[PDB]
Symmetry: C3
Subunit: 421 residues, 3 copies
């Protein structure tokens, strides 16, 4: 049996008092992780090549993820069965070296480690013909599936509260990768088309986005004994809310009291990302990000986000280092024009099985300091029925109440292990 996975677990404390806390800017879709992760998370993969004959094989792979608060020993939880697929490589003579698969599978996900941000990820139940050699590059075709909690109506209402049927979205993906635009540089282009797929006779709310597009171009350049990726993505309508390749064509959300509420996503997103890891010498490794993401919604409730951070590792020993992370966010409300921002600085002493900034397991002992000043937040007071501004961006002091994390500080510290295998 092949045993792989990912896991992170630890203990921590907040300077002001109590268990460790984590800091994410309101409106940002990520946090700089080093010394800022507050759960035990683990994926346990057990797979196996079940049949080989020469070039041909069938591999079976699975994934069972667990998330717990790590505030206690016995922590019951509903695990998420995330992968259960079969890949058959070289089963087609005419298209050599290509694999056909089916089943739930984490499919080719691009992400930015330090901020734990997946920026291209259409995984889920699906099927596809992967790595077709096309000469100048490798072509891949897939179709995955997601489903929104409700958003579909059995009959025509004018009442949004009537749209409570789970609504299935489909994504059709096409990628062309490994094209050598230049020396040391490769170029990948992908196109995603997602659409809400309605049952016979069901309807989406009036004005619902229905479908959309995600367009990706990633360029990897080999540098300083590491790499650097430069991405530019542009999504449209139903692809703007999730913003990684998954569709939400219905536009209806539900409050905690089961009330439907219209969160239309007609609009667009433009994401320009650059990240990488570069070694410099024998004592320095450094991971780094820079992003600018702008979701512009027709309903004025978008956001314009900017991040930047660096994680330079300095190696005292082939197995002992001192890692430090510094991240900055700033999100501006599309609706109000206000701005939330934060800066985090973590200083960690780690021991890892390896001399890389990518080597895992790592056992860290760290201290984190975050200072924010947020001038807006989302109104989630009341209920989708009591509240008409439910879910809208709103200034910090709106109607006397308060929104957002405020203008403050905090520092935490602890020990944690992280590992992929």
């Amino acid at each position: 049996v092949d045993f792989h996975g990912y896991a992170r677990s630890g203990i921590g404390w907040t300077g002001s008092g109590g268990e460790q806390q984590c800091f994410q800017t309101t409106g940002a879709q990520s946090k700089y992780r080093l010394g800022n992760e507050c759960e035990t998370y683990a994926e346990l993969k057990l797979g196996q090549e079940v049949w080989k004959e020469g070039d041909k094989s069938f591999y079976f792979d699975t994934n069972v993820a667990y998330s717990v608060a790590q505030q206690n020993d016995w922590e019951a939880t509903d695990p998420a069965f995330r992968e259960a697929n079969v890949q058959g490589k070289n089963l087609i003579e005419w298209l050599p070296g290509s694999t056909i698969w089916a089943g739930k599978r984490f499919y080719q996900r691009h992400d930015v480690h330090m901020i734990d941000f997946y920026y291209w990820d259409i995984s889920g139940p699906g099927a596809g013909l992967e790595n077709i050699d096309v000469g100048f590059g490798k072509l891949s075709l897939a179709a995955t599936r997601s489903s929104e909690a409700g958003g579909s109506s059995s009959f025509a209402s004018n009442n949004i509260y009537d749209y409570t049927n789970e609504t299935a979205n489909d994504v059709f993906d096409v990628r062309l990768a490994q094209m050598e635009i230049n020396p040391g540089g490769t170029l990948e282009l992908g196109v995603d088309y997602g659409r809400a797929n309605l049952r016979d006779n069901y309807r989406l709310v009036d004005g619902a986005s229905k479908d959309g597009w995600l367009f990706t171009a990633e360029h990897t350049q080999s540098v300083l004994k590491g790499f650097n990726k430069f991405v530019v993505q542009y999504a449209t309508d139903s692809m703007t809310s999730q913003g990684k390749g998954l569709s939400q064509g219905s536009g209806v959300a539900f409050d905690n009291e089961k009330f439907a509420y219209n969160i239309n996503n007609n609009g667009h997103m433009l994401r320009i990302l650059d990240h990488g890891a570069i070694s410099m010498g024998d004592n320095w490794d450094m991971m780094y990000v820079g992003m600018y993401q702008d979701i512009n919604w027709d309903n004025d409730n978008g956001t314009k986000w900017w991040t930047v951070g660096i994680r330079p590792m300095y190696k005292w020993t082939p197995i002992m280092s001192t890692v430090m992370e510094i991240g900055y966010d700033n999100v501006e409300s599309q609706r109000t024009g206000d701005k939330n921002n934060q800066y985090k600085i973590t200083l960690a002493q780690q021991w890892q099985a390896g001399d890389s900034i990518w080597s895992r397991p790592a056992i860290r002992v760290f201290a984190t300091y975050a200072k924010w000043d947020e001038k807006w937040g989302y109104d989630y007071t009341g209920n989708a029925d009591n509240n008409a501004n439910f879910g809208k961006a709103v200034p910090a002091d709106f109607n006397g109440g308060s929104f957002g994390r405020g203008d403050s500080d905090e520092w935490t510290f602890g020990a944690q292990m992280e590992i992929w295998w």
Copy 2:
């Protein structure tokens, strides 16, 4: 560690619109599976021979099953811990070659693959002395356990709503197998006696069946490089509802509003089954079923079911084939005499690790067409309290409302992998 299991996962679509749908006749206890399975289902077994000394060994085996809707990636679920037993072979000199076991175990289950129908399955927590060599055959003894949600009362009421205590049924199984009635043919006989086992001072409803019998005779004949099994089972009373060897001696069911309702099973069942897989040549494999099951209840709410289907596989290549399935059901209501029926036809193109119709993993791309015309259904409107006909068979148009799937059509299609290992 020994890693085994079963799993099926895939993506699909319904012709009319939306996610793929599955077709089962109302009253039938099964559906023809090819291109008609709508969930990711998986059992992950991890076992291990923990001690061997010569002929003697102790094997530990476990099973954790997961069922998810496969409409999304992250799908939290409560897994069912199904197996955790220990088998000690050859630990008894006097009864050589025999195994003693204890623990929850899937115990010797007979089933019919294409319709996924288990017809003899008493698995659950249990214990037993297995494979005792008796000369003409091998004798096996077991005792397993099931428990009904309620159906037992702490005191004597006349009110069924008072019978809400979980009620334990016990099954005592005895099988004699591997007797060579003829050349190429073996014969197995089994006898099951199940009884509801009441706590001191508890009572079952008046007229409750309490106990029952299941009697099985299976004959396996080696044929056309495959086999053919011919079964005849006859159950009695408390064994008629589940109809695979498990007892339900209490007769009380509960609606979704926690209301008890009397579903007495005094009566009998007669099941006559014939199924098998036969190869013909080097290009054809064919799986096939034929069944007639009649549950005759004292309360007139039984059913008389007939199925027939065939799954002929034609092999283009040692690893690529074209499988096709055609199934037919017809269930007649014992209460009303009406009839629900359906015919399914699936056409699939698969790639499998093997040249058999039994070879797994298989990766399929299929299209299914089902056409039904049901003239009855069960009344589950209202609640066991509002409704007096709750749970009874009732004609399609009963009291102006409607029951059953109607008279219709639909076609689906998709890709799916299936595998046992």
Copy 3:
């Protein structure tokens, strides 16, 4: 992958009727297990040495526990993700042979097998520097974490119902072990300091214990080809309720109707334990316990417990034996001075992979007899709001109702497998 664990599963019956029942004295924190365990319980560990270089290694270990009623096959359950840690041995030159770890880990738990009683167990999320060679012995340092369901208030109330915030306790452990006080004897000393760790601005109820101490001294003496441990522990205040090393500094409990209720633990506990396993000859093994535990609470609701039992195994064969267990409990209510007591006698025939009373797997067929006579119980009638005596010890016949198990008998029997691997 390394596959380890623990599991027990079986089938049983109660003499009087129905499924098997288990007998524990009211007020006792344990039951003599042989032939007195009523669930399938299993921990499935999958770990792996992920990196070794000479003396240095990093081991990853995990644990997923399942508990089910074993009254049926399909038993859905929320598994408890209990372990997910990484241990790095020999990563520090200055402190050779020592390990540093982080993650949720079952950390050095002392327990008494036949009664399944852990008497020193601070496991949970944590971190630490283990096995530091100190010359005369090995010094270990750890910090683990627990959290109480509520017990903390966001503001100052005088209303206990206001204290519903989860409250984190921290434990700081220090042990010095393997000191050879004598020939064949070792001595371990540990000191635990636990404190409720409040968020900025939160408050605990007035009079809440807040913190406490656990002090342990265990002495292991090698004897009769086995051992004998003699423990003496003394805890204080917040460490008296759990009584194994974990803190509960808040003092608030909640009824099933979400009502807070004050269960202050200011006071102390004195536990004097002696247990062991000794072989005598080639046919006799015998496990044995003797304990006296006194929790004296300031609020008069403590208890004074005494147990004694022996499990002598007589070996007919290297793989077949006859085990028998005899246990006795007696708990006196601190509040009322009454006494609950019981005596259990189990007689089992087992087959195990080994000639030891410690050899697993074991497959048992047993019969148990328990006879109790309890004269007090806890009042859990009503709700923390209806009831003012909620949770207090109270005589059997208090206010006409009844408390405790009564004065009775019962006998059970069944088959069960148990195994650690």
